[PDB]
Amino acid sequence: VRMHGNGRGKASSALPYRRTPPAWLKIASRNVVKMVCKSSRKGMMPSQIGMELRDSMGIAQVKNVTGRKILRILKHSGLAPEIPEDLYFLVKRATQMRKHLERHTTDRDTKYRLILVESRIHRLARYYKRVKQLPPTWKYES
């Protein structure tokens, strides 16, 4: 996390050059869309759908099997989240810090880290309002 803090950490997933399903999997592109849209009806957000297909079904990179991405499959089906997944987990983090700070009035470090997550919230929500993924009146809680 480079934007807030001094971390220069470089740990990512390195996608393959050879963008092709490995020919030992016989699952249809039609069925992967059914499995992706099913997991969203069990409440899974798009980052969690892809790991469950990566780990157990052998579908690394849903984009390569079905030509479109996971969140695009969800937006077509009507199963997109109301606010984006990035903004969800930052708001859900920021409310868990504040419920901590109401009983722990002098947690000096978590009051600093709460400034940083809300700075990320107001900086993402400016992106999503500009790109029209979010309504213009949106305006984070606190």
Partner 1 sequence: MQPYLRKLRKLKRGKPSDLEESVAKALFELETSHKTLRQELPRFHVNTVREVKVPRSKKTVLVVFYPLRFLMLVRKVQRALTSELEKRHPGYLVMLVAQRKITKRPTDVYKLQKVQRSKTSTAVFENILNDMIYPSDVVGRRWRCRTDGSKLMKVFLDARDRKRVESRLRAVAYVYKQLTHRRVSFGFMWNPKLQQVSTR
Partner 2 sequence: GFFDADLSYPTVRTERMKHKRRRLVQGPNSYFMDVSCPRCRQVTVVYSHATTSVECKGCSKKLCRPTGGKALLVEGCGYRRKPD
Partner 3 sequence: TMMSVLANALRTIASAERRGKRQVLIRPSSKVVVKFLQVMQKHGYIGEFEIIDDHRAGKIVVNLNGRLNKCGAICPRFDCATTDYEKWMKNILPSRQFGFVVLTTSLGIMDHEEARSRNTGGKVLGFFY
Partner RNA sequence: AUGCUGUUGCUGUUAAAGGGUUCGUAGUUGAACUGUGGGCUGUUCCCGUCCAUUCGGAUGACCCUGCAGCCCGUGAACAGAAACAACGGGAGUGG
Partner RNA sequence: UGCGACAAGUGCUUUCCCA
Partner RNA sequence: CCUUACGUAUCUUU
Name the site residues for partner 1 (rule: CB under 8 A).
17-18, 20
Evaluate the CA torsion angle 69, 125, 48, 16 in order and state its sign: positive
Query: Based on CB atoms, which residue is closest to partner 1, 1 or 25?
Result: 25
Choosing from 2, 9, 17, 132, the residue that interacts with partner 2 (CB under 8 A) is: 17
What x/- string results for residues 78 through 117 when contact with RNA is judged by CB under 7 A? ----------------------------------x--xx-
CB 19 within 8 A of CB 25: no
Q: What are the DSSP calls for 52-96, one per residue?
A: HIIIII--S-HHHHSSS-HHHHHHHHT---SS-HHHHHHHHHHHH
CB 77 within 8 A of CB 32: no
Q: What's the min distance (Å) between Cβ of 66 and partner 1?
A: 11
Q: Which run of H or E residues covers position 111?
A: helix 108-130
Size of the site for partner 3 (CB under 8 A): 3
Choosing from 22, 47, 119, 138, the residue that interacts with RNA (CB under 7 A) is: 119
Euclidean distance between CA atoms 119 and 91, whole angstroms: 11
Contacts with RNA, residue ranges (CB under 7 A):
3-5, 30, 112, 115-116, 119-120, 123
Q: Which residues bind partner 3 (CB under 8 A)?
A: 15, 17, 19
Give the binding site for partner 2 (CB under 8 A): 10, 12-18, 22-25, 51-52, 54-58, 60
